Amino acid sequence: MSRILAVHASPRGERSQSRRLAEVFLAAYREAHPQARVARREVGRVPLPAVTEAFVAAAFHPQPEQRSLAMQADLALSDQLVGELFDSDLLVISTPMYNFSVPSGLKAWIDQIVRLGVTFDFVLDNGVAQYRPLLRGKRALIVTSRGGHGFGPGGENQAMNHADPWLRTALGFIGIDEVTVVAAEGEESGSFEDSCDEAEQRLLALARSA
Amino acid sequence: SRILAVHASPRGERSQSRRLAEVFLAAYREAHPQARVARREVGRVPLPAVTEAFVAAAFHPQPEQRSLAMQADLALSDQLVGELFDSDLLVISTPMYNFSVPSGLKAWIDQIVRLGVTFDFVQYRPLLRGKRALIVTSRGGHGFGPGGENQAMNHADPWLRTALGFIGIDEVTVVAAEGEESSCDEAEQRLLALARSA
Amino acid sequence: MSRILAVHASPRGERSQSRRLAEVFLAAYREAHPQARVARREVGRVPLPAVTEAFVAAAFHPQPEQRSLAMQADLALSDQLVGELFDSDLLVISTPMYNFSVPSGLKAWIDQIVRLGVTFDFVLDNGVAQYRPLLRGKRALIVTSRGGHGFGPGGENQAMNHADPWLRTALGFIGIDEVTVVAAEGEESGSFEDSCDEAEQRLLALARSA
Amino acid sequence: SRILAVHASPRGERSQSRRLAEVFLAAYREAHPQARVARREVGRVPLPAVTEAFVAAAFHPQPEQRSLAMQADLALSDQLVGELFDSDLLVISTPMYNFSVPSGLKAWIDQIVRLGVTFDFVQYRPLLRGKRALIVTSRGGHGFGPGGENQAMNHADPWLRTALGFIGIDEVTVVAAEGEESSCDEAEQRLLALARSA
Numbered sequence A, C: 001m002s003r004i005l006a007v008h009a010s011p012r013g014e015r016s017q018s019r020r021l022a023e024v025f026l027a028a029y030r031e032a033h034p035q036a037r038v039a040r041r042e043v044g045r046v047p048l049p050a051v052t053e054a055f056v057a058a059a060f061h062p063q064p065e066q067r068s069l070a071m072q073a074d075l076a077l078s079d080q081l082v083g084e085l086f087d088s089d090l091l092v093i094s095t096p097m098y099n100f101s102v103p104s105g106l107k108a109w110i111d112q113i114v115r116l117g118v119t120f121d122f123v124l125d126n127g128v129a130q131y132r133p134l135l136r137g138k139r140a141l142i143v144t145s146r147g148g149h150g151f152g153p154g155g156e157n158q159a160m161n162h163a164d165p166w167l168r169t170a171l172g173f174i175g176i177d178e179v180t181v182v183a184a185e186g187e188e189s190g191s192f193e194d195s196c197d198e199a200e201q202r203l204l205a206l207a208r209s210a
Numbered sequence B, D: 001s002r003i004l005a006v007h008a009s010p011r012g013e014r015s016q017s018r019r020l021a022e023v024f025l026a027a028y029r030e031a032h033p034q035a036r037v038a039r040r041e042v043g044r045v046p047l048p049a050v051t052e053a054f055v056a057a058a059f060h061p062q063p064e065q066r067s068l069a070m071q072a073d074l075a076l077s078d079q080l081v082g083e084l085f086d087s088d089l090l091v092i093s094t095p096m097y098n099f100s101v102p103s104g105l106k107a108w109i110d111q112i113v114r115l116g117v118t119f120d121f122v123q124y125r126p127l128l129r130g131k132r133a134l135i136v137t138s139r140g141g142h143g144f145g146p147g148g149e150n151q152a153m154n155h156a157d158p159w160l161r162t163a164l165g166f167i168g169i170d171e172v173t174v175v176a177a178e179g180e181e182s183s184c185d186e187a188e189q190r191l192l193a194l195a196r197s198a
């Protein structure tokens, strides 16, 4: 009985390991819940617009009900993206690690959905902005694939990981505090089979209990 | 020194990080009248994301055999990398957006980290050398710098160091302006001082 | 009692004459029909993806029910764009003339909505593909603004007009044969006031009778 | 001759218009071993649309006073125009998409028609001279060429002539392959003949 939003961030299709692993979760979830709604939002194989100055002017307008129609057009994609999120209970993000972070498309999706007055708010206490998240009741699953090894907790390269740790922080800011990460490592060295098998078993167990 | 200046804010006149970087650049020019500055805009104009075509071309096992179509998939990348090779000092100006950098700057990084060109594999090895970087960043909030209560939330410039470090840019200076949504004088003064000695 | 799809193609906001003139029509239509639905689709101030080879492979797939999930993701924007069109009775397009044609964003929107099996079909008679439109019951209004003069019927530069004449042809291919064009000329020379006044009077009359 | 080759199909190996243009280019190179070819991809990589920032910059009443931000809005445009100025023969390969050209090619045209640079106003005047163009186009259907039953539906190459003509490219040859969805030998042979004399 969960409404799902699945956001796919790899540019690769059938060859994407993070997409493949997320679809394993999604299809397993579907077996346990034949009537559940799954919405898919592509941010890897299709371009997502970067934040523009026109976006900034509209999103942060002091009196939002006065936005011109052109300004509203600047926020239209964002509203649709935010709407999908509000209409979901569980958010699944699949993503590669690209250069120690996420693909630029995912960063752009994040930039569209953190919206003043919509997914976060603030007040000034003694002149200092205090921030409050506006999403509530959400969960998130991050499914990730990496070419190298050691980027996870306790790993030799843990300090170079600005992908899922950064995702955690951004999602938490808008109120998604329950976040699970499943990772496959060693993709470039292909061992990697063990890593993917373990990721699949983990996701199957999460699907059953979700 | 030859300077490549990468601007990441979508804002023009209103941008603090652009304005501060331009303060430095004008002061560096006075102290070194023969300096060349190349500007690469990644904030006010779109920069394409990495695609599957790009992955196939960039990681081609036998680059000398890339087809014309594959080379076309890498043309922007080659141009971007070329700008970096022809420079001594890299200046990057950027906002913090959602605890990281604007998507355009991430896209720029994704284009210039290139197997066989800016890094190699034997174990990974940087292929750029002799370069320095100055990162100029503006943020709406407070406490994202060294020793700050929000330091562990900062995935902008610390991530930049990691990516720059991987391709061999080790000498990196960060000058940050905080409290934009609520220091610029200090950052400015710091940038002028820096310009008078680089 | 018409459902409206308004597609705005100028990159300019408050300064857009074609956008301004179309909103005049839309607000006049709204006065006569308080309960009518108007959907707005921005193709000028926001990027619209160009057709890719991945798009081609999916749209023209011989057995569409076998498209992979990745392929479907390649068509997702297109489906949403086509859906807006099917859900409308009247299509309003506002557009500048740019270099004797339309802005690239509008061309991209057109490239997304002409879809095999969806807005057009074909069969082979003696080996020759015969095309059949799939949209029916639609009308279209094209509102256009031009910097120069003489691009309309009988004008000295009529043969250089590949904007609205080309729109007519593309819309007709998918079945929109009832098409009206309202044009303001002389924008770069600013006379132009006469041209805009006449365009407004024309659009107000069309709104009342629609 | 110096050649600028603009490719408009999103397709790679499978593209007919790209393949035919490459047949011509290879044959022109054999006949003129010292020729330089610049390739500009507008089909397989995105090309930005004109924005309002671009309009404000390009039609600036006093260009010498454009701010750095405005110049950045025109950087791609300047690079694209530069390629055109440095060439003698422009070769454009393109599909017909929906009775016109792919959106990328329209975007390319929108970037290179520039007030004060490729055309002027006194009455409009072309500023490019001494250039030729070869347009190589592939179409799925039949009868879109001169004397064809669908000639009045053709807004691809005839529109290209109008846009090219406005900026001063008057000498234009069109070679078309039709019936792709259902002539290439002829077009090919025609391209080889053309290469052996340009």
Ligand SMILES: Cc1cc2nc3c(=O)[nH]c(=O)nc-3n(C[C@H](O)[C@H](O)[C@H](O)COP(=O)(O)O)c2cc1C
Pocket (backbone or CB within 6 Å): A010, A011, A012, A015, A016, A017, A018, A019, A095, A096, A097, A098, A099, A100, A101, A145, A146, A147, A148, A149, A187, A188, B050, B055, B110
């Ligand atoms: C542009 C690019 C950047 C990459 N950066 C990293 C990286 O920083 N660290 C890493 O371990 N692997 C990196 N990789 C390897 C990918 O993370 C790995 O191939 C991953 O499985 C790709 O995700 P996908 O299979 O879902 O497409 C990179 C790959 C590409 C194409």
Ligand SMILES: Cc1cc2nc3c(=O)[nH]c(=O)nc-3n(C[C@H](O)[C@H](O)[C@H](O)COP(=O)(O)O)c2cc1C
Pocket (backbone or CB within 6 Å): A051, A056, A111, B009, B010, B011, B014, B015, B016, B017, B018, B094, B095, B096, B097, B098, B099, B100, B138, B139, B140, B141, B142, B180, B181
């Ligand atoms: C989309 C967006 C996201 C932002 N995210 C953060 C943030 O995570 N932390 C912060 O301190 N400020 C944030 N800000 C505020 C900007 O960092 C601040 O306005 C900065 O000065 C913008 O850079 P610029 O002036 O060079 O355009 C954000 C602003 C925008 C528009």
Ligand SMILES: Cc1cc2nc3c(=O)[nH]c(=O)nc-3n(C[C@H](O)[C@H](O)[C@H](O)COP(=O)(O)O)c2cc1C
Pocket (backbone or CB within 6 Å): C010, C011, C012, C015, C016, C017, C018, C019, C095, C096, C097, C098, C099, C100, C101, C145, C146, C147, C148, C149, C187, C188, D050, D055, D110
């Ligand atoms: C890039 C560009 C190309 C243009 N090309 C033409 C043209 O080919 N013919 C013409 O008469 N006006 C041309 N114009 C002028 C515009 O058509 C005119 O300013 C129009 O009103 C702009 O539409 P808008 O007001 O809705 O933004 C062009 C303007 C721009 C910015």
Ligand SMILES: Cc1cc2nc3c(=O)[nH]c(=O)nc-3n(C[C@H](O)[C@H](O)[C@H](O)COP(=O)(O)O)c2cc1C
Pocket (backbone or CB within 6 Å): C051, C056, C111, D009, D010, D011, D014, D015, D016, D017, D018, D094, D095, D096, D097, D098, D099, D100, D138, D139, D140, D141, D142, D180, D181
């Ligand atoms: C989106 C799209 C639109 C097309 N529109 C037309 C058309 O209007 N008329 C036509 O004859 N063929 C049309 N075609 C068929 C192509 O013109 C034909 O496949 C051509 O060879 C493609 O060029 P390329 O092989 O260089 O990629 C269209 C194809 C696509 C994918």
Ligand SMILES: O=C(O)CCNC(=O)c1ccc(N/N=C2\C=CC(=O)C(C(=O)O)=C2)cc1
Pocket (backbone or CB within 6 Å): A098, A099, A100, A147, A148, A149, A156, A157, B113, B124, B166
């Ligand atoms: O000394 C220290 O703590 C750290 C020193 N560096 C390491 O140990 C190290 C670095 C990268 C890595 N992953 N492969 C990657 C990383 C980044 C990429 O962009 C690509 C790519 O294919 O583009 C592949 C595993 C280990």
Ligand SMILES: O=C(O)CCNC(=O)c1ccc(N/N=C2\C=CC(=O)C(C(=O)O)=C2)cc1
Pocket (backbone or CB within 6 Å): A114, A131, A173, B098, B099, B140, B141, B142, B150, B181
């Ligand atoms: O419990 C934990 O791990 C962390 C506890 N949260 C904090 O103390 C905190 C969070 C964010 C912050 N930055 N403000 C920002 C962040 C996002 C924006 O979009 C803007 C904006 O101006 O648009 C400004 C300062 C302090």
Ligand SMILES: O=C(O)CCNC(=O)c1ccc(N/N=C2\C=CC(=O)C(C(=O)O)=C2)cc1
Pocket (backbone or CB within 6 Å): C098, C099, C100, C147, C148, C149, C156, C157, D113, D124, D166
């Ligand atoms: O001899 C013949 O039949 C035709 C000879 N040319 C003409 O008479 C003529 C050309 C253009 C025009 N409109 N202004 C324009 C046209 C194209 C543009 O790109 C721009 C722009 O601002 O970018 C403005 C009016 C008349």
Ligand SMILES: O=C(O)CCNC(=O)c1ccc(N/N=C2\C=CC(=O)C(C(=O)O)=C2)cc1
Pocket (backbone or CB within 6 Å): C114, C131, C173, D098, D099, D140, D141, D142, D150, D181
């Ligand atoms: O009555 C009138 O004005 C016109 C009468 N219609 C005709 O005779 C006619 C129309 C289109 C055509 N080209 N085929 C095309 C057009 C669009 C496509 O997307 C494809 C494709 O392969 O995807 C191929 C040939 C003939």
